[PDB]
Amino acid sequence: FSENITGLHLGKVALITGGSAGIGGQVARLLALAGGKVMMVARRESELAVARARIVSELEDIGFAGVERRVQTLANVDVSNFESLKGAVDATLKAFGRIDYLINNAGVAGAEDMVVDMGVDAWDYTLDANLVSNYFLMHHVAPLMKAQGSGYILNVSSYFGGEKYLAVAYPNRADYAVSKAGQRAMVESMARYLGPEVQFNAIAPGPVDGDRLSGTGGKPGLFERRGKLILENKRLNAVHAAAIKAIRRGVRVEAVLARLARNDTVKMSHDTNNPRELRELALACAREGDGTCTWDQYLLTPQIAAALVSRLRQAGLFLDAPEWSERPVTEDGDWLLRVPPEDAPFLPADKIAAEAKKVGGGVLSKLYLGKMPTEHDVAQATVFFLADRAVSGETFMPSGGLSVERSTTERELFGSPKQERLDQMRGKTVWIIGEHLVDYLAETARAFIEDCHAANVVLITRTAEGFDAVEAQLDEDVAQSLTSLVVSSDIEAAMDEALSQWGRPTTILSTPFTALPGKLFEAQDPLTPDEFREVVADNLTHHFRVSRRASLYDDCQLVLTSPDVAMGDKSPAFALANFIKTTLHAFTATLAVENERLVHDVPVNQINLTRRVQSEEPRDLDEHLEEVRRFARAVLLVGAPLPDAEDSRYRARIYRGMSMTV
Amino acid sequence: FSENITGLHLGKVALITGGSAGIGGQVARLLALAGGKVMMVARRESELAVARARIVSELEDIGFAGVERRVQTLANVDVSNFESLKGAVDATLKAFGRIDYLINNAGVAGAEDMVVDMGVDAWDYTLDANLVSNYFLMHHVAPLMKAQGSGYILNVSSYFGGEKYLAVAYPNRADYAVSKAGQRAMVESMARYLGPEVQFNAIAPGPVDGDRLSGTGGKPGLFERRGKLILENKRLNAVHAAAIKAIRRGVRVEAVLARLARNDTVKMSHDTNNPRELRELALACAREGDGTCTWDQYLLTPQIAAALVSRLRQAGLFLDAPEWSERPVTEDGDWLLRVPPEDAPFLPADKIAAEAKKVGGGVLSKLYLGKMPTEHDVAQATVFFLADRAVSGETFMPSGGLSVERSTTERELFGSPKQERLDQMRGKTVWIIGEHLVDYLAETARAFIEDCHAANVVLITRTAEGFDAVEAQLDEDVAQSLTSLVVSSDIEAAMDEALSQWGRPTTILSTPFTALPGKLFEAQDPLTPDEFREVVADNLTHHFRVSRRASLYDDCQLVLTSPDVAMGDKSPAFALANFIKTTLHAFTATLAVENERLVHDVPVNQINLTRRVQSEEPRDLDEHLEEVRRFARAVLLVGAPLPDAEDSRYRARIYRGMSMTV
């Protein structure tokens, strides 16, 4: 095979990110064997130098001439850094005089945390490295490819980023899932604008057999790594649930934490004065050991104990607690009165291996082709797809026929709930976060106040002017139930302040503060990489930042809104709204599954203010007013306290992680 | 070196149907150049020998050896002749000792009629040639491939068979669209069973630039062919519409037909004897001429006149017409008093060109890559895709980035309508067609009688026992409004009989008479091609045969039901149900668009009794009875008199062509 494809890509120039190892290294190799010129770029110079050296030796053996000039490298290329990526483009053009293929292969695993534990810096890094980087490179290379009359951009997404019309939950990996869904969503929504010269496709392999998946150089396998992650999160969630259950029935949080601080399972189960939830917690922990590990004798490690106090703090559970209300956040690891010894594992290796085989067996059992593709198999597929000249706007699936069955599909709304469900809002507080969507914010506030008899709507805006514009659309009697909170630092701080001032909300509606830009690849005024980064911040990160507080609130429902497009607009805003709809759906689906594993059990659903077909968008005022009213009905449908469809498996499923378009 | 891509397919054996010309011919050539062995099969020896000679000549020129033996042919292989297909498998095994790739490429254009004008034989011819032929070959080659441990089956579908989760209307081509959708639906639903050994994928190009599309030797181009067909259907629909509107006002059908028989636009314009509808029709036809063609002087050709009286008859509008009901059907073309002269064209060449330019310009404008792919481009893509070993169950799109925007996604029910709307059923007649789905048929009859106050439910069954079983589930007071009609010849005759006896239905629910088989590719007891043909007859053709009558009934709503799977079943019945759901959705979407062009304006919607996710299927008695109740609610939602497009453009579109799963 590898010596007999010299004609497939002869003379084509490829820039491949993350080209030192894995799929990227194999694509670099096979493109060179197929007669292409390759600029391989990566962070690590040693891996890159060895990989290129091996390719050049193979090129010599199959009798290429001038092999050194055919494969070039650029090290210390960090995809999270724009200057560093620009150097990769400049190096490719300096070496080869053009770029034919851009392979957006580089990726990071990301935070590997539940959303409620995930840092904003970790989320931002995953989105910058995996998704914004790809737009940065497209921005710089697309004009070169259009000017020469041809090009190919390929995004290396993942099967776990979902597929068109069908989101997939990726618990503990929401930042990664969003970044991968985003790579694909760019192909679906932007290929129109890269044509006619540039083909723009994605690949979405699932698990891929090679050194990184198997584990090499004394490193655990990716199934083993998720197994360990799963047990840590099960212990955190279990300790957290016991603390919350105790606080709900009126145990002081200071008393719960003083009892957990003793961090002794045998003493905790036996002690009579410990709350039943802590006794039962400690009993269950004491049964989980193997004779080596320590998680049967200690409830908590410093790291899990830090994650626990963070969740309690962010739920507002320290607001009236003398000590904790004021303790430095820097000290969240340091409150245990004894900690597991460092000479022994916390977690049992047997349960790690068992969870890893649940993970591996689960994916391996859903492969139509019976075995995981290797990195070479996925690289071979990639090099074959790159030779096609007729496909654009598609995601190829070189996954081994991976089929994970799920019903998380975007729905058009035409349905309603009983007034009895709405009556449960009477006397409650709701938060609406927004700025630019005045008609939608106003009608939703009116529906909650006038139709559902909510006592207080807290409208959390970017500016006082944004508050006044919504208030000006309400009757005076309705407006007396509208409270203003203008963001002063960040949305999480504004949410902490709203909770402190007016209490626990029953419904949170998250809308973007800013309208989408009306531009993408136009030569006159394109959407710059910094502008695209802000679109991601305002339309994805924003919802994450709201969600990571909202998911900690008992009896609260969370509603995420994707973008609107002004009536009559004919710009790429409509493509950008559909990009966000797809990418945010990965988040919604993932968060809905995580939240069911938390004691707070917060439902999350998504409402879309843009339809899939631009001719079906509202085109006159009657259709606009129809959409505004439908939007408020959709918010009440997924925002009102969820019905007793705990009886029905079917109905329970259709109020968590839905994406509904109005 | 320049041209060497042998590593892709060296020694792989392909059987290619329609292998002498078009895409099939180019796939045979490129597989051979890539080191493959090919058995090219088609009807004409002469065309096969030219294709084979050209390939053999080119191989020789690229320096291949033993080249005669690498490229073989079999003539008289016709996809409508299943014995000739078996002969093609045998010839491949005789020549090469094995089969690696099956390329299901041969196909026919089909009836090129609106559903209400299409014959059952023409429909059956299309489905047998384009869909059942593919299953026939799959049935014979799959065991060979599984035994050797590897294989690839590639179905050549069409963009206009839709894509996963998104159906597409192909007006005038419902037979073809269903066949193409079926080729893709087999890949989506059956790949699991062809694995792990066999990859099973489709391609779905749209228009392909070559001899067939352009036209050769005085044969019209495909765009020109659709243009003429559009003018013929617009003339038939306009004459039909005027006739129906006159009959609705109470003009006797015999009087309308006596006036139309005169077939003189200028006299019909002016004569005060004529109904206003015929005067307006004649005036409109009179204005459409070009000084050469005759359709401005005659309303009808014999062929259009035959299609007109067939529609009136099938609507039951001759039941009380003495001359017309008795006329033999063979004289449907003989009733005009004058006919256009045979030396001059009926249709104007210029309007055919204008329509052809609307058709061609439409799809060309939706290509992201700007240019229609050539036959060579699509074959090259196919040969690249066939080298991949990681993809199964997917449809590749080598279409030039063809993007036709539509909102036809399969939806899962959580929607409702006003009791006022259900109340318009009061006093009306409903038809329920079915046999095996007793619980669903009973609850739907009960819902129509008890909840909507329908006067009469005509339950059209295969057997008396099928009726008795539904009747036995009803309270005696509800059962008073249930009428039996047992099919004695065909469903069309039973519908004619129900119409004659009990009058025009407001709602027609079509359900399949037979349960799906519980088998597919099992070595012990596979689904034979003849059994698969009966699945098609019972689950696709059955609905077509109901629809071609129902689509002619004023103020009627048509509901098509796709298959159920018995609770606890773990057979490929589930895969077969999902195959039918996808394939029938092509029919539903296409017929909804055609029917809006007809004067009867009959809405068509589809209800699915099987879910996409097998673990979501009802798993106890309680979930069964919830699904049964939800089914009847879904039939009422799409079966009761619908919301006017004038009230809402958004709502109007939801209730035409939908596929809803309960």
Ligand SMILES: CC(C)(COP(=O)(O)OP(=O)(O)OC[C@H]1O[C@@H](n2cnc3c(N)ncnc32)[C@H](O)[C@@H]1OP(=O)(O)O)[C@@H](O)C(=O)NCCC(=O)NCCS
């Ligand atoms: C498909 C998949 C995403 C589903 O994730 P999931 O729903 O979390 O299920 P997992 O297999 O991870 O879950 C194993 C167990 O851990 C639990 N679990 C996982 N995350 C948890 C959390 N944060 N808190 C509590 N329990 C958790 C699950 O609930 C399940 O518990 P159960 O067996 O006791 O019911 C997951 O199995 C997976 O990661 N598969 C491999 C993906 C892959 O191959 N990707 C390669 C590209 S990056």
Ligand SMILES: CC(C)(COP(=O)(O)OP(=O)(O)OC[C@H]1O[C@@H](n2cnc3c(N)ncnc32)[C@H](O)[C@@H]1OP(=O)(O)O)[C@@H](O)C(=O)NCCC(=O)NCCS
């Ligand atoms: C895309 C497509 C399927 C849409 O079909 P469509 O909705 O019937 O639209 P068409 O372009 O055929 O319609 C042209 C006109 O004829 C009308 N028309 C078509 N069939 C009709 C019928 N049976 N009765 C009445 N009017 C009809 C349309 O409504 C339209 O009228 P308008 O300009 O007044 O709106 C069609 O345009 C088409 O065949 N395109 C080419 C597909 C192709 O490339 N094929 C590849 C090989 S399979």
